Design a protein around this nucleic acid. Structure first.
Lengths: 171, 178, 128, 106, 184
RNA sequence: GAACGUAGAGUUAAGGUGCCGGAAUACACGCUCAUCAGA
RNA sequence: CUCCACACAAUAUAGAUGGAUACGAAUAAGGCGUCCUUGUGGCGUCGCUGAACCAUAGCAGGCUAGCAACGGUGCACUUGGCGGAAAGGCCUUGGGUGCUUGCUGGCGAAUUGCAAUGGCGUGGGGAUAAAUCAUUUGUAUACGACUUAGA
């Protein structure tokens, strides 16, 4: 579904004579808090040898976008498993918000790579601030000055049975 | 081919030669009656053959040709289902040969074949001329109705034979006026 | 003559919470998505897929990535509300809204006035 | 003067069915000019008549009527379920059936 | 809403139009399908040619579309037979249907369903390529029809232009303003 | 998928929702035009 | 085609109860109007659905009264033209004769009691153009069939 950002902190349990461990913080994109916590443990075990019984979650939080009006540009690091071998991948995404970019990224990774939501491990999403750091050509296609183009798919849903008009993609 | 017998003893013409509309309006076939065979002496004019400029003797077949007379016409219009005659047009005076052809019991019939059709020239011809102008207007191809002078022939059958002939001259209107 | 997706292209969201509200493309996202704002019509600034919206032949000049207070300024200075209302298509939309707004005694008066107008036209007809 | 219709004609589509088992009790109706179930909410509970014409003249007329009513919507296209007093003969699939406005909420 | 629905076949897809019509006949709507020779098939000519070939081991386009349509309806039932008896299919537009409006089915349009840059197939060329020797007869009648229809439309446009003039001079009257008040 | 008295009403599992065939020719994003894809 | 006898009829059958209401092509283009330099010209318009248009008051549509126009409209005629793809329809002349809700009148409606829809077949005679059987032929032929010819 439509995901959400989550500040998730874990601190694996202060034992006897070990007070206050190091409060490991991550940021998870998930549809709810529950799968966010599950993914947080799923990364924390890959960080080092914890279990969900070994530690605990400090604070689950949703964090919104500060400026969800501006179209930002993003460079994303992803790791995932082409089942036998892993490899990283760096993608550049023009999007208004972060979590919608991560949504579209999951859709694209499932489109081109047949990879599930569990197989995809987000490394980093960060805004590309200035122009020309867009290494990808296709996002750079929309960085031109005074960009104009016509609509493709003038075909629409006609919603009726018979048409008297002999219609036309008149665009 | 499966060898089943002929439908009519007058054999059908399934295909006619190509229409040239630059030639004058003229027939494309004829119906005669074969008399017999004989032998003809002629000279061969065939260079490339050893028999060039040499007397050859040749078997021929002669068909009696009575002059044929036209008594009607038939125009076919094109349909997407094929050729179809929209009408046929007859003349007024038809012989007892032809009126015999429509009848099976001519010897005892009251011979009532084309009586009310003769009333169609009792008028000016308005229905008939309407039909002629219709075949001018419609009916892309024209066939004429012809029969032979079988009484001028040693055939014992006094009943002449009717046939259609596709008319491969020019100008459908000039064809039907012809 | 083509419409183009561009900044300052005033648009009309035929399907959604707007279901017809005049907005304007502030910025493009890709071939599929854009950024719009309709603060005069009341629809807020948002990202949208282009299927949910239609382009209008009207346009004006709008700055790249312009904020909402700047957007409403350039909207009013464009005065494309009046240019929209002057268009026969928006007149037809308001007309098909008004036809749904009709009452049965109103519709009966429509019947009577159509009779009377038809009488006058058929007198005006068959003399010219 | 020209029209006297106080109903909406609509097609008797079918019986309620799976791929293998059909229910003759519930019948399926297409009301003309209705594509949404929300428009079909207006037509809920309305009194339906199938009008047909018999050979014989039962009580002063040869025309007979089955009655019944809309129960609920069916599907996304505004197809409408209906229950009658006696069920339909099923040779009336695609037949015009009259749907009356009473019981009127408006 | 109409008793007999007249459907043009030009620029349409085989199966989608067949599905729509097959649904409407089982709904009871009487349908005549005209200009059948201008139906269009997805894919190239050659694929569809091989499909008619390995099916064949009737050549008219009407027979083809009737085949496709009859496959969708449960033809063996009496109800399906009544539905097929509702149907008429014609290549070209013969009379009387030439003088009536021909609707289109947008969800079966070629220009809407097909992505641009795809090969399609004209049904009349297919039928002539498999032995339907009547396509030249069709276009000859259709040319005359388009002549007479252009005449009709030229007359109709002038008369409706006169109607437009009469409505223009009928305007500014108070009865027109009262119609404006009511919305017309 | 579900241990099944006889019914009525509702909700669903699986399975589907172009037509047969009941139910979106829904929506969204990418990929494939195959001279017998693919489902 | 025609004279006696009797069975429905003035109807409807896959589904009547306002109207099936006509350019063609193109779609990375069209249309309409207009102007000229008639063009692949220019200008403007339009689409973004028929949710349109046309018809639509009157006892399931009564009886009358005028006002105004030379309209509209039905029917039977009548004039002429168009229509062959399966034309079987379209359009027009001219009157007739109805209605007219374009406007304004005047009488009737009830109790139906609060919804229950509310020419074609037979049976028996009469007349008729042909066809068949029969005769006959042999270009045909196991036989049919073919095929002459006969008031």
């Amino acid at each position: 579904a439509h995901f959400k950002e989550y500040q998730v902190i874990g601190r694996r349990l202060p034992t006897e004579s070990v007070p206050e461990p190091k409060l490991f913080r991550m940021r998870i994109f998930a549809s709810n808090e529950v799968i966010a916590k599950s993914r947080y443990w799923y990364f924390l075990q890959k960080l080092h040898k914890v279990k969900k019984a070994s530690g605990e979650i400090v604070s689950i939080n949703q964090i919104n976008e500060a400026h969800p009006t501006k179209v930002k540009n993003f460079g994303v690091w992803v790791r995932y498993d082409s089942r036998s071998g892993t490899h990283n991948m760096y993608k550049e995404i023009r999007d208004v918000s972060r979590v919608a970019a991560v949504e579209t990224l999951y859709q694209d990774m499932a489109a081109r790579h047949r990879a599930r939501f569990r197989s995809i491990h987000i490394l980093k999403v960060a805004e590309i601030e200035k122009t020309a750091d867009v290494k990808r050509q296709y996002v750079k296609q929309f960085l031109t000055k005074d960009l104009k183009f016509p609509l493709p798919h003038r075909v629409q849903k006609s919603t009726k049975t018979f048409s008297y008009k002999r219609p036309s993609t008149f665009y | 081919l499966p060898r089943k017998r002929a439908a009519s003893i007058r054999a059908r013409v399934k295909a006619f030669p190509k229409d040239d509309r630059s030639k004058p309006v003229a027939l494309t076939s004829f119906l005669g009656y074969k008399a017999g065979m004989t032998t003809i002496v002629r000279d061969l004019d065939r260079p490339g053959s050893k028999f060039h400029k040499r007397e050859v003797v040749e078997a021929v077949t002669v068909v009696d040709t009575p002059p044929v007379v036209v008594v009607g016409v038939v125009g076919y219009v094109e349909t997407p289902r094929g050729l179809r005659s929209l009408t046929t047009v007859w003349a007024e005076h038809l012989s007892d040969e032809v009126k015999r052809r429509f009848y099976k019991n001519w010897y005892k019939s009251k011979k009532k074949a084309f009586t009310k059709y003769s009333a169609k020239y009792a008028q000016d011809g308005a229905g008939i001329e309407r039909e002629l102008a219709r075949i001018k207007k419609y009916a892309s191809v024209v066939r004429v109705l012809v029969h032979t002078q079988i009484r001028k022939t040693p055939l014992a059958q006094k009943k002449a034979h009717l046939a259609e002939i596709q008319l491969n001259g020019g100008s459908i209107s000039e064809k039907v006026d012809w | 003559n083509w419409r183009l997706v561009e900044v300052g292209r005033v648009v009309l969201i035929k399907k959604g919470q707007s279901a017809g509200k005049l907005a304007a493309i502030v910025e493009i996202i890709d071939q599929k998505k854009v950024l719009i704002d309709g603060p005069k019509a009341g629809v807020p600034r948002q990202a949208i897929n282009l299927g949910q919206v239609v382009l209008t032949p009207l346009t004006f000049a709008l700055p790249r990535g312009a904020r909402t207070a700047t957007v409403s300024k350039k909207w009013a200075a464009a005065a494309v509300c009046e240019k929209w209302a002057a268009s026969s298509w928006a007149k037809k939309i308001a007309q098909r809204e008004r036809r749904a707004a009709l009452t049965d005694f109103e519709r009966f008066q429509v019947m009577v006035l159509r009779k009377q107008k038809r009488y006058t036209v058929k007198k005006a007809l068959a003399k010219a | 003067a020209e029209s006297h219709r106080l109903y909406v004609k609509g097609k008797h589509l079918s019986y309620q069915r799976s791929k293998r088992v059909n229910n003759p009790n519930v019948s399926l109706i297409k009301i003309e000019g209705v594509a949404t179930p929300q428009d079909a909410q207006f037509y809920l509970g309305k009194r339906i008549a199938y009008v047909y014409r018999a050979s014989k003249e039962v009580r002063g007329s040869k025309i007979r009527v089955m009655w019944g009513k809309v129960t609920r919507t069916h599907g996304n296209s505004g197809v409408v379920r209906a229950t009658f007093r006696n069920n339909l003969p099923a040779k009336t699939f695609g037949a015009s059936v009259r749907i009356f406005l009473y019981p009127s909420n408006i | 809403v109409e008793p007999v629905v007249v459907i043009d076949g030009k620029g349409h897809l085989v199966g989608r139009l067949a599905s729509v019509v097959a649904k409407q006949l089982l709904n009871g709507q009487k349908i005549v399908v005209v200009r059948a020779e201008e139906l269009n098939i997805s894919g190239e000519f050659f694929r569809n040619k091989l499909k008619y070939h390995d099916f064949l081991r009737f050549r008219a386009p009407s027979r083809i579309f009737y085949k496709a349509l009859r496959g969708m309806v449960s033809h063996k039932t009496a109800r399906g037979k009544a539905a097929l008896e509702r149907l008429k299919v014609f290549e070209g537009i013969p009379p009387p249907y030439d003088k009536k409006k021909r609707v289109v089915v947008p969800q079966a349009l070629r220009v809407l369903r097909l992505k641009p840059g795809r090969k399609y197939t004209t049904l009349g060329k297919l039928s002539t390529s498999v032995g339907w020797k009547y396509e030249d007869v069709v276009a000859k009648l259709e040319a005359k029809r388009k002549v007479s229809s252009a005449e009709y439309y030229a007359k109709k446009r002038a008369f409706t232009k006169k109607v437009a003039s009469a409505n223009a001079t009928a305007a500014e009257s108070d009865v027109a303003k009262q119609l404006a008040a009511l919305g017309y």
